[PDB]
Write a protein that holds these residues in place. Structure first.
Motif, short mmCIF file in Angstrom:
data_model
loop_
_atom_site.label_atom_id
_atom_site.label_comp_id
_atom_site.label_asym_id
_atom_site.label_seq_id
_atom_site.Cartn_x
_atom_site.Cartn_y
_atom_site.Cartn_z
N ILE C 134 0.98 -1.16 0.00
CA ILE C 134 -0.04 -0.08 0.10
C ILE C 134 0.96 1.06 0.06
CG2 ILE C 134 -1.59 1.37 1.51
CD1 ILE C 134 -2.82 -1.42 2.38
N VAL C 135 0.99 2.02 -0.97
CA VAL C 135 1.60 3.36 -1.11
C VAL C 135 0.99 4.36 -0.83
CG1 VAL C 135 3.21 2.16 -2.32
CG2 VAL C 135 1.62 3.07 -3.58
N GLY C 136 -0.51 4.46 -0.61
CA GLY C 136 -1.17 5.71 -0.46
C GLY C 136 -2.47 5.32 -0.02
N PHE C 137 -3.32 6.15 0.88
CA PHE C 137 -4.47 6.09 1.07
C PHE C 137 -5.42 6.97 0.45
CE2 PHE C 137 -2.06 4.20 4.53
CZ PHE C 137 -2.73 3.23 4.85
N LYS C 138 -6.49 6.71 0.23
CA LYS C 138 -7.72 7.66 -0.04
C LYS C 138 -8.89 7.35 0.49
CE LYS C 138 -9.63 7.21 -4.10
NZ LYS C 138 -9.70 7.32 -5.75
N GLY C 139 -10.11 8.02 0.34
CA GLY C 139 -11.23 7.78 1.05
C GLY C 139 -12.06 9.05 1.15
N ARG C 140 -12.92 9.07 1.95
CA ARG C 140 -13.95 10.20 2.22
C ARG C 140 -14.05 10.29 3.70
NH1 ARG C 140 -17.70 11.88 -1.12
NH2 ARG C 140 -17.34 11.26 -3.24
N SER C 141 -14.22 11.64 4.17
CA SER C 141 -14.23 12.04 5.49
C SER C 141 -15.43 13.16 5.77
CB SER C 141 -12.93 12.45 6.11
OG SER C 141 -12.20 11.29 6.31
N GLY C 142 -16.04 13.10 6.80
CA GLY C 142 -17.10 14.40 7.20
C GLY C 142 -16.80 14.26 8.74
N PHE C 143 -17.75 14.05 9.43
CA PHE C 143 -17.56 14.08 11.04
C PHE C 143 -16.51 12.67 11.19
CE2 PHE C 143 -19.08 12.67 15.28
CZ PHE C 143 -19.08 13.90 15.93
N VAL C 144 -16.68 11.75 10.50
CA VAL C 144 -15.67 10.74 10.84
C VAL C 144 -15.24 10.05 9.49
CG1 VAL C 144 -16.54 9.79 13.12
CG2 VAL C 144 -17.78 8.93 10.81
N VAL C 145 -14.47 8.95 9.40
CA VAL C 145 -14.14 8.30 8.16
C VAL C 145 -15.28 7.90 7.64
CG1 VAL C 145 -12.65 6.88 6.79
CG2 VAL C 145 -11.85 8.11 8.89
N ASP C 146 -15.80 8.17 6.61
CA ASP C 146 -16.94 7.62 5.63
C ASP C 146 -16.54 6.30 4.63
OD1 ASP C 146 -19.61 9.69 5.54
OD2 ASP C 146 -17.78 10.59 5.94
N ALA C 147 -15.39 6.54 4.06
CA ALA C 147 -14.81 5.53 3.23
C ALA C 147 -13.42 5.50 3.23
CB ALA C 147 -15.56 5.70 1.91
N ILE C 148 -12.87 4.37 2.81
CA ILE C 148 -11.52 4.19 2.75
C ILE C 148 -11.07 3.54 1.36
CG2 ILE C 148 -11.17 2.39 4.10
CD1 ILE C 148 -8.58 3.66 5.22
N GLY C 149 -9.90 3.77 0.76
CA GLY C 149 -9.25 2.92 -0.34
C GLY C 149 -7.76 2.96 -0.27
N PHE C 150 -7.20 2.28 -1.04
CA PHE C 150 -5.69 2.21 -1.24
C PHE C 150 -4.98 2.21 -2.44
CE2 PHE C 150 -6.81 0.82 2.86
CZ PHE C 150 -7.54 -0.02 3.08
N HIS C 151 -3.93 2.81 -2.67
CA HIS C 151 -3.11 2.70 -3.84
C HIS C 151 -2.15 1.93 -3.88
CE1 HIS C 151 -4.23 7.20 -4.12
NE2 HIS C 151 -4.35 6.90 -5.25
N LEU C 152 -1.73 0.96 -4.67
CA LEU C 152 -0.96 -0.36 -4.53
C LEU C 152 0.08 -0.19 -5.41
CD1 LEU C 152 -3.68 -3.25 -4.27
CD2 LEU C 152 -2.58 -1.82 -2.40
N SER C 153 1.26 -0.82 -5.08
CA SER C 153 2.38 -0.89 -6.12
C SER C 153 3.46 -1.95 -5.65
CB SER C 153 3.18 0.61 -5.79
OG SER C 153 4.43 0.49 -6.71
N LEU C 154 4.10 -2.33 -6.69
CA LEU C 154 5.19 -3.34 -6.53
C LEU C 154 6.23 -2.74 -6.12
CD1 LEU C 154 4.85 -5.43 -9.89
CD2 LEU C 154 4.31 -6.04 -7.44
#
Lengths: 154, 154, 154, 154
Positions: C134-154
């Motif tokens: 995992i080389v990076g995180f992404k997602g959605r936030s408001g009052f708390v974390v709404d969603a999360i995702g990951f950037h992947l690399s070799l």
């Protein structure tokens, strides 16, 4: 954002001229064997790739120089792999095209050097690799190999 | 620095149990068709991959469930591709193993959703994809699909 | 063919709901530290990445929940790295949105497990990684974390 | 299987000689600006990279040639990006080492060609790119740029 169903790899090249017809073997998992022919240039060029641990015969690019010396480069896959490919591009007078073709090619693996094949005349080019692998070949071919390029991957 | 002749891809998973026998199709350039069977779980699972513009038949993983319904998902390759694979993992009482297997699987492409197949019972799992493609499947199989994983590439 | 000047990485996710506001830290060369807050859900989520051997603090995503317990996860970079990230997504009643948010998160490295943080209630999700990082995180936030995702690399 | 916490990229090169001191900027998400100096060769070479939408000043490699003319190549990032880098490697009379240095460099983007800079003498080299991007520079420097290499990524 993904917009197509076909995966991709880094592609470098092409080195050479606009003559002949374009071809692209695509990408695989490695290189097991290279079969080419040479004389005053590089004629035929075909590869036996590795596809997930098993050999896969790539599309042939026979060219049309029956007088050329045929050569088979059998690599000790997977311990032996290319770390550099170089050569020369330039016009081959007898073709009467006035366009650059691949006059020579040299293949250097971590074990040894194969070539130079053909005639080292014209403009040189070279692709030393420090990290990653050539996982596919592409280029252009007519009577000889007009141009060449490579697919790269970690 | 490169130290091996075998290229690689990102791999995620496995989801599922430790039963059955491990298998790994390896990686290709895309997915053309998915063949599977389902009943109270996912039984057979086989894929017709794309390999540089031509179909390549992946190794078969039929499992052994005569009563399961069979499905053949023929994707409109390359315009249609998976953007998500999800399902359920859990014990299937009748197998008498007490180990998790793939109870259900759902395939979502950029065009439509295929499934759910099997029975949505147990613990859910999902792999939504925002960028990149699944270019190969791996897992474990016995009478049914015990586990599944994916090879990813840009 | 290259059509943009910005490089890319494989991206999986997002797991979670459509609420909050989108954020994407982008990609780096690794993960050094994770700072989050948790209670009945995951509130803050901020990362210190590795950028070519040196720490690089990514943008913060504190959310707006001030009462959560704060946690600092300092990884033994580069010897220690994530091999799995899992959690739970589901509605948090006091938000009065009826949309899923990240209720819990668990981080597993090749050395140990951190968490579970928050409340393990709702729909589980997990991303086991066999090859790649995992080389990076992404997602959605408001009052708390709404969603999360990951950037992947070799 | 993942065994390290640091991600990687394809690396090609080096082109040039063994003199000077080795340097490697590492990898980023793109290139915003290139600052160099030239005379009978390439002297200084520094880059301002893009790192997820924000500029990142790479380490400087000023070399030591006060007489060289400075040049600043500001790319219209991300719309403009390098599609080829080429140049010449050769000995410098005033170095009397018989070893090559980067005598010339030419930068071609999808919008324009910058250069040639320096002197086009020695052996030419070139890296045309069909798919992918240069996301980092590496090389060797003393009074001038002895060698140069590139980190590549999709």
């Amino acid at each position: 954002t993904q917009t197509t169903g076909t995966s991709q790899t880094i592609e470098v090249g092409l080195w050479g001229g606009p003559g002949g017809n374009a071809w692209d073997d695509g990408s695989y998992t490695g290189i097991r064997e290279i079969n080419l022919s040479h004389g005053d240039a590089i004629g035929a060029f075909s590869v036996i790739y590795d596809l997930n641990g098993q050999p896969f015969t790539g599309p042939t690019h026979p060219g049309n120089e029956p007088s050329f010396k045929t050569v088979k480069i059998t690599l000790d896959f997977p311990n032996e792999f290319l770390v550099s490919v170089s050569g020369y591009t330039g016009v081959l007078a007898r073709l009467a095209t006035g366009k650059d073709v691949i006059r020579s090619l040299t293949f250097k693996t971590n074990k040894k050097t194969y070539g130079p094949y053909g005639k080292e005349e014209g403009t040189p080019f070279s692709l030393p690799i420090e990290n990653g692998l050539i996982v596919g070949f592409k280029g252009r071919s007519g009577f000889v190999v007009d141009a060449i390029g490579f697919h790269l991957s970690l």
